[PDB]
Amino acid sequence: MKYIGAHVSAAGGLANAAIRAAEIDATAFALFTKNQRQWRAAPLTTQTIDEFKAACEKYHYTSAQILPHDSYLINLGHPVTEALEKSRDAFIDEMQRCEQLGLSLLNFHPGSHLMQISEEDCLARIAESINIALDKTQGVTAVIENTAGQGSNLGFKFEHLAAIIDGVEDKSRVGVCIDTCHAFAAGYDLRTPAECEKTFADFARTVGFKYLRGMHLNDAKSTFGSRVDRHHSLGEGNIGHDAFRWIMQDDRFDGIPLILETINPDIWAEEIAWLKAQQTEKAV
């Protein structure tokens, strides 16, 4: 099976994310569990947890279908001790909120080095940030998202994800999410099926499909290898529809949240339906 949705708004409460995913007929969704531009939030109440779990059950969303995203403030590779520890505290908190809400995955961008430490030292700080969070929680997998590679952000090479995974000690609770816009911006071509196979053969050899826990399905307003992170609606950008035809037919993308982060949410329902229809058996 494939699970297909979008990063929907949590405005008004977390249960509203499940309701909004249902309104666009998604079979997966993403959300922020708290304000993505703040370091902390009110503790979850038993009421808020209960309302959120009841909505997930009502609308047929198990934890295997939900891919929360961490905040924009967290840098798990930060070169300054105080800021690294602030980020590790907030990331632990994000993982704890996920456990309390019945979730099992947490998608995050890995970190950035600010040109103050080497890439390899930054990657090792990120791995150890994951190790700390995993030692303090249960049941939640740290899902590293690849990036476009703006500024001093890492995660734009598959080798970055693999170097982090190598430093994580409990490999049963680490994985990756491939964002197609980020990969294209970073120079992994996706414009034909043959280029998709090339790119994911590189992914297989460096990271491994063993670790694939989600996808973000985004076309790209930016150009090939621009290293600029700007999404587009599926098939309106520089990737085109073919990569998403190919993903929907390939079984290496089964069983995981496939999450739209496309720029026009008024056509999310259309995009979800288009993705689902690709799975219908077509005559010769």
User: Which residues carry out catalysis?
Assistant: 37, 69, 72, 109, 145, 179, 182, 216, 229, 231, 261
- Look at the chain and count its residues: 284
Residue 240 corresponds to which tokens in the numbers above?
Answer: 């085109």
Instruction: Closer to Fe ion by CB, 69 or 173: give it.
Output: 69
Residue 191 corresponds to which tokens in the numbers above?
Answer: 């414009």
Interacting residue with Fe ion among 216, 222, 232, 234 (CB under 5 A): 216
User: Which amino acid appears at position 154 of this protein?
Assistant: L
Instruction: Closer to Fe ion by CB, 84 or 207: give it.
Output: 207
- Give the C-alpha separation, 164 to 103, whole Å: 23
Query: Does the footprint of Cl ion cover residue 223 (CB under 5 A)?
Result: yes
Interacting residue with Fe ion among 128, 179, 219, 271 (CB under 5 A): 179
Contact (Cβ atoms closer than 8 angstroms) between residue 88 and residue 130: no
Q: Which does 133 bind (CB under 5 to 8 A by kind): Zn ion, Cl ion, Fe ion, none?
A: none
Answer yes or no: is 166 a known binding residue: no
- Give the C-alpha separation, 270 to 88, whole Å: 38
- Give the C-alpha separation, 264 to 128, whole Å: 37
Contact (Cβ atoms closer than 8 angstroms) between residue 233 and residue 264: yes
Query: Does the footprint of Zn ion cover residue 229 (CB under 5 A)?
Result: yes
Query: Does the footprint of Cl ion cover residue 238 (CB under 5 A)?
Result: yes
- Give the C-alpha separation, 52 to 45, whole Å: 11
Query: Does the footprint of Fe ion cover residue 213 (CB under 5 A)?
Result: no
Answer yes or no: is 70 a known binding residue: no
Interacting residue with Cl ion among 224, 228, 235, 261 (CB under 5 A): 224
Query: Does the footprint of Zn ion cover residue 70 (CB under 5 A)?
Result: no
- Give the C-alpha separation, 88 to 92, whole Å: 6
Detail the residues annotated as belonging to a binding site for Zn(2+). 69, 109, 145, 179, 182, 216, 229, 231, 261
Chain residues binding Fe ion by CB under 5 A are: 179, 216
Binding site for Cl ion (CB under 5 A): 147-148, 150, 153, 223-224, 229, 238
